[PDB]
């Protein structure tokens, strides 16, 4: 007698983005299936976000959760005349929030998130929508107090690429 219904698809009228509304489904598949989504969220939020006042922790955390190749890509965003440190500096800030993360394989997941810019004149720019693709692994517990109190699991990004929508998005 048991029969199964379908997750309905939600279509965002503004972005055309289709989200699957789960049907009576909150299942977690395995250790790190939802634990992985936490790390992927914290990684993207801290990596993409910016605030002169808290960035030192987000900066070091991002590096702590990144493979050296990835760490370098990240560090470079704060270099040169177009550095986040000079462009945003203490005049503008970036707020980032993750809407949904869904793992898709063997060290890989898709992160759907938004971002917006705020500034010293009290204004806010229109929010943008972005999607990150994260390749990752875990390197086990770190052996320094300054690392274990931030990334005890050993989460590490080995590949990273976030693409914004085209035009409006």
């Amino acid at each position: 007698q048991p029969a199964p219904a379908p997750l309905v698809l939600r279509v965002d009228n503004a972005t055309g983005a289709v989200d699957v509304v789960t049907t009576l489904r909150e299942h977690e598949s395995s250790y790190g299936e939802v634990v992985d989504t936490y790390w992927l969220n914290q990684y993207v939020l801290n990596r993409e976000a910016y605030d002169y006042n808290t960035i030192q922790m987000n900066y070091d955390t991002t590096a702590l959760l990144s493979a050296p190749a990835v760490q370098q890509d990240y560090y470079k965003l704060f270099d040169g005349s177009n550095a986040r440190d000079r462009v945003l500096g203490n005049k503008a800030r970036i707020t980032v929030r993750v809407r949904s993360i869904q793992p898709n394989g063997r060290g890989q997941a898709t992160v759907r998130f938004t971002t917006q810019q705020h500034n010293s004149n009290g204004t806010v720019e229109a929010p943008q929508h972005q999607i990150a693709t994260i390749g990752y692994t875990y390197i086990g517990a770190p052996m320094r107090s300054s690392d274990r109190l931030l990334n005890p699991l050993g989460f590490q990004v080995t590949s990273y690429r976030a693409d914004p929508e085209i035009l409006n998005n």
Binding site: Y59, S66, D85, Q156
Partner: peptide
């Protein structure tokens, strides 16, 4: 055996000097 360790790069926080 792991070699599983984080990267090395320039400091995360730098001075927000005024201008």
């Amino acid at each position: 055996v792991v070699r599983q360790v984080i990267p090395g790069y320039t400091p995360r926080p730098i001075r927000p000097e005024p201008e």
